[PDB]
Symmetry: D2
């Protein structure tokens, strides 16, 4: 599953539909990024630029011109064909091939952007520009507008109105097409296979980074070359650090390991967390905490649907957590009073859910306290956790346990679809999986 | 093998030895780098900062103060301990533990750098600063000097002399310690194992990126989490693109595949290229080009020693290449005249060798045309190649063949040591390896 | 005559009337400007900021908030009262006194602008900001918007729309109130007195700068402390340089002197040019050129009225000039053909008229080729000139003559009012004035 | 008196003498400065650039190249001749005429600076650059060094050492040549004539700015077109504000007026303060304060000589002030104890002396607490004052009196020469001068 040229075109048209007549929208590619000295990190296109193009080159700018309510057209600035640069560094789309390949009306050399952009903006009323997104983009836009402002003797005029297109575009991204959902479904499947693999490979004495290796290899084999975020493999006390990415420790017999890892497939993020015993068997204490987190996730999966909210479902999770922690003696007091005091917060200190898409922590308005009413097409994670610090004032057997369990879902007309349920999470199923692997 | 605290300390002392009395050297950590939106790329420390610290955090600055010819001391600015930031994002060394851990005299919070740096520079004659390396560093240094310049009424004075320490430090890095050579030897071994694996796994129908996956997994399993540069897997015509990193094509029965890949192990780069038949058997045409590149490499490995140069060895390679290309009818004319015309350049268009170390294309002065006389302790690659474009005006059977073969060596008292000879390169040995793998 | 608090308030209200509901307009003061080292030039307030405040301090920002269509209010950020800074550098208005003094609703310390501005913009739909006017202003505005964009978890939201208020405000400035016209009338009178003085003082052997001295002294004595632009005193060949401000030469018996000088009175510019003989008597050649320029000015003054344009009146001037130059043998050919060839341009190379107000070359849209139809309330200069270079291919007696004659006018319902006719320009009147002065 | 080409050349050579072999010094002109919109302030050349050139254009850079200990040469970058730009804006020196006019070896177009500067710096060991003086200069220098650093394949090398030339040049400026002293002597005479004029013109009912007008006119008539700093005319309570420049008040019968004003003559500053009765007669209270300030100045003028210091002479002044204030009941207690408590500071809160030269507050190292030992050739002001605030807790008759009296001196072998004693300061002489003027 992928996103095709015609869909990128529909998206451009949908933006144009929302634009004022006599306007242009400017969407800039990501800069290349230094890793060390003359070596660069593998290129990652800006998500918004990608959303409108599927074009994976730097030094590119998409310009959507809405001349009036019936007439509009698109211009791409992109790197020129150049035999020598291409022999050295890779093929470039160039100007001749871009209109057919991408479905844009015209293509111009990026080297000419300062000579040409002001001409495209001249006489327009509105420019849509994500001011502050990139310095290099701001320089180009500001220079063009300055030429126009100062060019009255050449009969030039600048658009006086600049609108940030990010709110409009991010609202677009928040609601996935069926094609996007298909891509995300595949990202979920790939990511789940990687997590299953990690559980089947994990043995005491392996390093945390070994599981990262297994996961990344599995992503790659299905054509997801890169993770969507830096893989977290937190064993023992490291599981209590939320974005632990050092992954440097030897995994101990008797500890849990928390793996938060997700692929990037055709630009879209998977995002799964599973926590499991390094030795394949939960201790009683580990199981007692695990059961609370799992009940939290299972209840959330039953509840998530159009018409509820992240805030509302979070309330149910908080009650499950406080109730369970009281039962174990980690919290003490009346459940309702403890809920009113947000007494869970030392142990569950992050959000239950974030949007998911071209970014793992995806764009889109949540509403105050994530109260926005859910609707079909929204894609989000569900990631309850409990983290009991090594020095927590709690019964000793619970100290140093960090557990999170995370699935990716899409809101549907009738509830939700779980994209990541193909990797097990019931503790008996985790144990069975690991027992079977450990016998081989 | 690794680099220890005491070696980082020796390096600091060696720099101090070269500094003027009444001076301070300022060495800044790399900034964190955005991948997309709120996600960052895995952190890569600045090589020079790493060279003097082995410290893998951002927002850190090493200050070496040489008060006079006998008295000197070190101050580290680094991120403070903070419970909440650490629960979220990972452990921090902090100020209390840094002096013992890193072997620095004093540690201060990075948040206080603007309040403290000018006080350390006050009254000194010279500041050593890599101006232009990082914007954030320049801002900090310029602000401190400005406070001093403008602070005469507070009895403050700025050092009037600013010296770029990069030439001195890069000359240090150019000559490896035995401990560095041991690390590089391990990087070579790890990298060679990965290349052997790629040859043993490669089958027609696999994608180029599948071999990247095998390689990266092998790096990881030996504790080299990241590659030292973006992996190149160029099959068929893609082999004729030097830094081809798309790795997106299905590998065809009958094509060669060129793999240029290297691990990063304790900060140090491996860097190997092997080219081999996708189907395990060189065609006659492929073998004829391969033999010339291999002879070029083998001769270079015999010749590299103290007292010669990259330029001198390159001359021998150019003769081998021109001679071989004349024999095959790719070039036509007198060998000596063709050499004088640099007639090889359409087919071998890059350098034979680069320095290797904390950066894959390592720091250090080459001399004009890479004429610098080689000495023991220098580490460099040897990477002849021939690239015959799909549309080259040559006998048709050679079109679309890209071959490079690359080893990493260290110059010794008696010649050189090859760090990467544990992955095969003789064509009969490549074929034997692949035949054996293909039977399993 | 001056501009009062109530008028500044009317202007603010007129801007608010044009703003969208749910918006704020930000108007920034001019920065102080270095002359040399620690000395600054005399402060000149930004014209737009002045237009809305009459407030002559730096580090000030006017914020007009239009909450909805009935409710609006104003906030001034300005420098705090500070005993020590004031003993040293001068009195400051401060926050307590500003609301009554300026007629703003609230005043806050400029030192708090970053802590407060984002709070004022939070939740608004539109921000009006002159992007690119001042770097320091852009930094403040961009920082506020960034805080809002990134502050969703604190329930903050940025206005997505930024509108340049300069076109609206400049259109306001283009049409003067009766009170503005009274101020400009006084500026014209002061400026005319200065020019009369220069003619009465001028003698061969005086330096060009001596006339500058007389002029500036006259401005000062009427309470116009500063000129509105750098005074031009171009004698002989220097008269052929349009913005000659060196004023360094000894004025020669037999040369003309061209003086272009204007006061700044309560923020408003006078702008007069007179050219006259250094020795009090035009030569025949000087008179012949002078007569053409004077006829050009006199005709323009008869013609300027509502319903014509600068372009239209310029056409009449071009015919007068070409006709006169043909008569003298400076141009050769058919007048209509010469007009069609713009043959006047080597000798009259600048515009006939510019707008006049808070800036000497005042703000406001001219239309293509200055074709905008004139309306009552517009204020403009009328400044024909002829400049015959020392090496021009013309009858020798005309070489090195530079003549311009410039008056300031206001368009009225019935034509125009000349604000600067109280300094003579008829050649016989110039000669009479100078003869009378030279006898004293 | 002026500074000639040969002296500018001697200065360049004196700098070169102090430079390391294999180095270049870069001295940049001041940028033009906006007053409002398209109008600029009158150009003021950077003092250091002026010191080495006497060249009054922007977009100019002096480059002094010291190839080795015997060979050196100079290159000027400056604006090209351009007929059209010159007709519009003024004559330019250009490249052809600059070598002879300025005594530099070569001149190049400023438009070519980026193409040429790196070529001049290539292979040098040291660059002398005033980092942070001007943004535009830093951009040019940083760009050149970056080209060199990155140009090893083009056999380019950057100087690794950057030295701020300001300390060396400012030490040069601190010691005046006889020719500089002659210019400063004339500046003192011009400035004194202006102050005499102000005293002779002052009448109750005139505005403070009227005296500014008289002063500026007098500067101009002697060929000092501009003041060296913004003129201060502080009458009554305004005299208690140190840099009062509003000069907006009507001068009252019975008040003092303090005038601090100085011309700029051939780049050099005069700097005189005189305080006198608006009505020509000191009141008893005014005289009592005046006498203390005058005794302070007269004693300072007797004492200033080689071998003492500003700090030492200040001690004598503090004793005079404390003694006098005790006598009048403004201070109460033991004189020595009051001195130890710095009890004078509420009334005399500024320094007695600053260096004087191309800047009014001239460059040069003062030493801690201005303790540097004075030597012949140093030029400084002597400016005791007493300022009794309107609300001071002192006998009522002294409230609102601000008095300063300031002369400019040059340290000589035998003491000092007073450059400004030609304007009176003894109270009986002030009264006589004013009485005589008031009778006319
Ligand atoms: Cl391009
Ligand atoms: Cl910190
Ligand atoms: Cl403030
Ligand atoms: Cl130029
Ligand atoms: Mn998540
Ligand atoms: Mn996650
Ligand atoms: Mn290599
Ligand atoms: Mn390589
Ligand atoms: Mn004008
Ligand atoms: Mn004018
Ligand atoms: Mn002074
Ligand atoms: Mn003074």
């Amino acid at each position: 599953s992928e996103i095709s040229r015609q869909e990128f075109q529909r998206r451009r048209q949908a933006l144009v539909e929302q634009m004022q007549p006599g306007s242009a929208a400017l969407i800039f590619a990501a800069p290349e990024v230094t890793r060390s000295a003359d070596s660069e990190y593998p290129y990652r296109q800006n998500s918004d630029f990608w959303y409108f193009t599927g074009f994976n080159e730097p030094e590119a700018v998409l310009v959507l011109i809405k001349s009036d309510d019936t007439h509009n057209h698109s211009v791409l600035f992109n790197r020129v064909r150049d035999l020598t640069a291409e022999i050295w560094f890779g093929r470039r789309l160039g100007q001749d091939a871009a209109p057919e390949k991408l479905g844009v009306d015209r293509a111009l050399a990026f080297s000419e952007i300062n000579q040409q952009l002001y001409q495209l903006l001249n006489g327009l009323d509105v420019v849509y520009h994500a001011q502050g997104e990139y310095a290099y983009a701001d320089v180009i836009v500001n220079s063009a507008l300055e030429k126009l402002r100062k060019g009255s003797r050449q009969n030039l005029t600048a658009p006086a109105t600049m609108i940030d297109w990010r709110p409009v575009v991010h609202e677009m991204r928040l609601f996935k097409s069926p094609e996007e959902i298909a891509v995300l479904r595949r990202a979920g499947e790939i990511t789940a296979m990687a997590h299953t693999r990690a559980m089947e490979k994990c043995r005491p004495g392996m390093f945390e980074y070994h599981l990262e290796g297994e996961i990344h290899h599995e992503f790659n084999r299905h054509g997801a070359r890169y993770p969507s975020y830096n893989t977290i493999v937190g064993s023992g006390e490291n599981g209590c650090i939320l974005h632990y990415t050092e992954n440097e420790c030897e995994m101990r017999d008797g500890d849990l390991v928390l793996i938060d890892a997700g692929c990037e497939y055709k630009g879209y993020a998977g995002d799964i967390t599973r926590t499991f015993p390094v030795n394949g068997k939960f201790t009683q204490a580990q199981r007692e905490i695990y059961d609370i987190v799992l009940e939290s996730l299972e209840t959330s999966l039953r509840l998530y649907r159009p018409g509820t909210s992240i805030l509302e479902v979070t309330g149910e999770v908080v009650r499950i957590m406080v109730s369970g922690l009281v039962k174990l003696g980690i919290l003490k007091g009346d459940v309702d009073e403890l809920i009113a005091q947000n007494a869970h917060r030392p142990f569950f200190m992050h959000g239950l859910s974030h949007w998911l898409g071209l970014d793992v922590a995806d764009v889109g308005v949540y509403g105050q306290d994530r109260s926005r009413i859910l609707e079909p097409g929204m894609v989000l994670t569900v990631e309850p956790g409990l983290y009991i610090a090594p020095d927590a004032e709690v019964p000793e057997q619970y100290r140093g346990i960090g557990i999170r369990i995370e699935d990716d879902i899409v809101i549907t007309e009738t509830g939700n679809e779980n994209l990541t349920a193909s990797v097990v999470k019931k503790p008996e199923e985790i144990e069975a999986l690991m027992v079977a692997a450990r016998k081989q």
